[PDB]
Each structure stands twice: as structure tokens, then as C-alpha cells.
Design a protein around this ligand. Structure first.
Ligand code: ADP
Ligand code: BEF
Ligand code: MN
Length: 441
């Protein structure tokens, strides 16, 4: 009930870069949506995750918003001119035949998200603005290329550089376990998080683990049950709210890297960006009444992340989104220097584009891998490629060849024609890929 008037300018992109916890998501977003409604601007709100989409409903209760996500179960009047969906849904719809409205205003929250669908959505939106067809607001405390890892916070934070373990320990890290508060611990990989979580559990701690595959289900447990540690990958940088007193940050993670144009490996761990570091630290210091919060960090930051597969993968997506005849959207300008590709090199014809989309949406394949399969002319249900690669593409778990009973009634060793380490980097990813290779997804 203290609305501040925003003069929403046509043909403009604004970056709302207030510090973490300043109220972008909970205060400024509703104000903008009210102005958009008042002035009758057809508007889309882009949430990074289903978890945040649900929370945005609380902030927007009593405003006419169409929630285009099963994460919210609200009765729609059919008259709403504001739509809410996830970054990934927005990009996926753009790749499909499905008509996406030509919105007058795009509001992307947690616009730092570097998953390929988010990077692509930013390119599309910025292109629409540059063409004079729409306005946009990108909300993030950490715009592309920030070099500040220690922004302002609602309460003071105690910043300390320490040695952070990335393996189980039996001594040398008493400060981790001799602590009666609640800790969010950012780890370099799902497997390292499993090992640390087991160590913590053996030491009597209650641990919840979060990764992209599990986030949308395990995050609820952080609200609804008692815990001592959350052990999380980078997915928790995207507007994740914890009632926590301490963050432990390894400051590095495994990175997918395309090697010689022919395979994806997981390299590193390599340092995180300043943006990632500031978002990780930004999970604490958020309560103005609580002055004790600590950030313990394990090394430096770097901006040398052009080796990351996500940039090229964003181009694969954008190349397959229609704007106008002959026009391919560039990445948003601050990100466009991250990748050297020819605009349109990854454009697919209609049937192959359909396969590319289905491999990602229903197959849950990484963008790069989905592209290799689709561009080879393979149809979605034809899994022969999972078995006919070279011998060095053999997938191992527990030091033995992963084996599958195939749709054609043979026990076969998983040996994909194209190797993307993301499909076999932890037990759960591998299980899903084995199902896929069996024709049982
Ligand atoms: N359910 C809640 N009730 C009350 N305050 C909350 C709730 N969730 C978050 N907050 C607080 O609201 C403030 C603004 O949060 P938010 O808008 O999410 O920040 P930003 O998007 O700027 O990072 C912060 O102090 C945050 O901790
Ligand atoms: F910048 Be807030 F943490 F979304
Ligand atoms: Mn936010």
C-alpha cells in the first residue's frame, strides 16, 4: 500500500540491480505489475524456477495474473493480461509452433540465471526491445560481468576466507561441525555434495541436498522439515530463500566444456564468477534484525567462463526461434562477447527442430546433445545412437560398463555416438539416461 510510480518507457530495457534482499522480487515486482495492469500493457513475468513462481503468487495475491505453470493452482478469470511462467517454459514455447504473445513488457526476475534457456530468453527479449517492439526489465543484483562479490546486504555479514573441504574428513574442520546454526553449503558437484552430506550425516547432522534434477521437490523440505545443512549446487543462486545463519562456499564448480566440437566433458572444478559468489553470499545477511550471519569462502572468483558450454547452447536455441524473416536474435549485449558463433549456424528445418525440442523437453537431454541427435536426422524414439558409438564413449558406473536391456531385446552396453558427460555425471543422471536408452522414458 505504498506504491511508487514507475514510468514504464516504450522501447527500453532497464536493469534493476538493487543489492540482494533489497526487495526486487517482493516489493518492486508487484509495483511494476500494478503499473502494467493500470496502463493495460500485455506483460509476461519470467521466474527462474517453479519454486519461485509459487512464491511470486504470494507476492501477487489479488492481482489478475495468469499462472502458466502447474506449480500454482489458481482459478483464472480468462481476463488477465499478465502471464507468469518459468524462463525455460518461455524459451521452449518460442521453439514450438504454439503462439507466444507479442508482449509489450517482459519482466525477467533473477536475470543472472546462466542456464541456456535463460541466456536465450534474454537474447530474444533484448532483440525485441532493440527493434523498438517492446520494453523489458531485467531484475538481478548481479548483472552480466559484475566484478563485485561482496555487495550490500540488509544486515552485516562476516566474510572469512577459509579452506573449505571438498571431500569427507575425519579431522581438521571442527568449525564446520562445532556450529549450532543452519548452514547452506555450495559444493562443486552433485557427487562431491553426496560425499560431504554423508560425512555430515555420520557426524549427526540433518542434511538436505539440492541439485537441478531435485530442486523443485527437495527445496520444499527446507521450508517444511528441520535441517542443519543444505548442501547445494549453483541452482540455489536463483532467488532461493533459506532461513540460514551461515554460508559455506567452495567458490568453484565443475563446468561443461565442448572439446573439439565433438564431446562435452565436465572440467575443473574451476572458479565461480563474481556474480555467482555474490549470489551465494547473498543467501544470508537478509534479515535486518539478525546481525550475526557468516560467509566462509574457499578461494577466488574468475570471469574467464567462455569455455562454458551454456553460451554456445544458448545460440543453438536462439537460432531456432523465429522473430521476423532473416532475423536471428543476438544474445543480450553484455553476454554476446562470451561466444564466437555464426548467427544461424544451428538453425534446423521444421521436422528436425521438432525432434530437437522433444529431446530436450521429454528426453531431458542437454541442449548440445539434443542438437547432435536432431541435426543427424534421427527421430525422437530411435535410440540406436545410444549404443553405436566408439569404444571410448562406453559409459561406466562403479567401474563397470553401464548395460541396458534395449527395446529390441538385447542386453547392450551404453556407448553413445555422442558423449555428453552431463548424462552420466551422477547416479540419478545416469539412471535417467539408461531409461532413455531403453526406450522407457
Ligand atoms: N515470506 C517472507 N516474509 C517476510 N519477509 C520475507 C519473506 N521472504 C523473503 N523475505 C524478505 O523480504 C526481503 C526482500 O526479499 P526479496 O524481494 O526476495 O529480495 P531481492 O529479490 O531483492 O533479492 C528480504 O529481507 C527477504 O529476506
Ligand atoms: F537479489 Be535477490 F537475492 F533476488
Ligand atoms: Mn529476487
Amino acid at each position: 500500500h505504498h506504491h511508487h510510480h514507475h514510468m514504464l518507457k516504450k522501447k527500453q530495457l532497464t536493469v534493476l540491480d538493487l543489492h540482494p534482499g533489497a526487495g526486487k522480487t517482493r516489493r518492486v515486482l508487484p509495483e511494476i505489475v500494478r503499473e502494467a495492469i493500470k496502463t493495460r500493457l500485455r506483460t509476461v513475468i519470467l521466474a527462474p524456477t517453479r519454486v519461485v513462481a509459487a512464491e511470486m503468487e504470494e507476492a501477487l495475491r489479488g492481482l489478475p495474473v495468469r499462472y502458466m505453470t502447474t506449480a500454482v493452482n489458481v482459478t483464472h478469470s480468462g481476463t488477465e493480461i499478465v502471464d507468469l511462467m518459468c524462463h525455460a517454459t518461455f524459451t521452449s514455447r518460442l521453439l514450438q509452433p504454439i503462439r507466444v504473445p507479442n508482449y509489450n513488457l517482459y519482466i525477467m526476475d533473477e536475470a543472472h540465471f546462466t542456464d541456456p534457456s535463460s541466456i536465450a530468453a534474454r537474447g530474444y527479449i533484448s532483440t525485441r526491445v532493440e527493434m523498438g517492439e517492446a520494453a523489458a526489465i531485467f531484475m538481478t543484483a548481479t548483472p552480466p560481468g559484475t566484478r563485485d562479490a561482496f555487495p550490500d546486504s540488509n544486515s552485516p555479514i562476516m566474510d572469512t576466507e577459509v579452506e573449505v573441504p571438498e571431500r569427507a574428513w575425519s579431522s581438521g574442520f571442527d568449525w564446520v561441525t562445532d556450529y549450532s546454526g543452519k548452514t547452506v553449503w555450495f559444493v562443486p558437484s552433485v557427487r562431491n555434495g553426496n560425499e560431504i552430506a554423508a560425512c555430515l550425516t555420520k557426524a549427526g547432522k540433518r542434511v538436505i541436498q539440492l541439485s537441478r534434477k531435485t530442486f523443485e521437490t527437495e527445496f520444499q523440505k527446507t521450508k517444511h522439515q528441520e535441517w542443519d545443512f543444505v548442501v547445494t549446487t549453483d541452482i540455489s543462486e536463483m532467488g532461493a530463500n533459506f532461513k540460514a545463519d551461515r554460508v559455506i562456499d567452495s567458490r568453484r564448480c565443475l563446468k561443461p566444456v565442448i572439446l573439439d566440437g565433438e564431446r562435452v566433458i565436465l572440467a575443473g572444478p574451476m572458479p565461480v564468477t563474481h556474480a555467482s559468489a555474490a549470489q551465494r553470499r547473498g543467501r544470508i545477511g537478509r534479515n535486518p534484525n539478525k546481525p550475526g550471519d557468516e560467509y566462509l569462502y574457499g578461494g577466488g572468483c574468475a570471469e574467464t567462463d567462455e569455455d562454458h558450454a551454456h553460451w554456445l547452447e544458448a545460440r543453438m536455441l536462439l537460432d531456432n526461434i523465429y522473430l521476423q524473416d532473416g532475423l536471428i536474435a543476438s544474445l543480450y549485449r553484455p553476454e554476446a562477447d562470451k561466444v564466437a558463433a555464426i548467427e544461424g549456424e544451428f538453425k534446423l528445418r521444421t521436422e528436425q527442430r521438432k525432434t530437437f525440442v522433444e529431446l530436450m523437453k521429454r528426453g531431458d537431454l542437454p541442449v548440445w546433445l539434443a542438437y547432435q541427435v536432431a541435426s543427424a536426422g534421427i527421430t525422437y524414439t530411435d535410440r540406436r545412437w545410444c549404443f553405436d558409438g566408439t569404444t571410448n564413449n562406453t559409459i561406466m558406473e562403479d567401474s563397470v560398463p553401464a548395460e541396458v536391456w534395449t527395446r529390441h531385446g538385447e542386453k547392450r552396453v551404453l556407448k553413445p555416438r555422442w558423449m555428453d558427460a552431463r548424462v552420466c555425471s551422477d547416479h540419478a543422471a545416469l539412471k535417467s539416461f539408461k531409461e532413455f536408452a531403453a526406450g522407457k522414458r
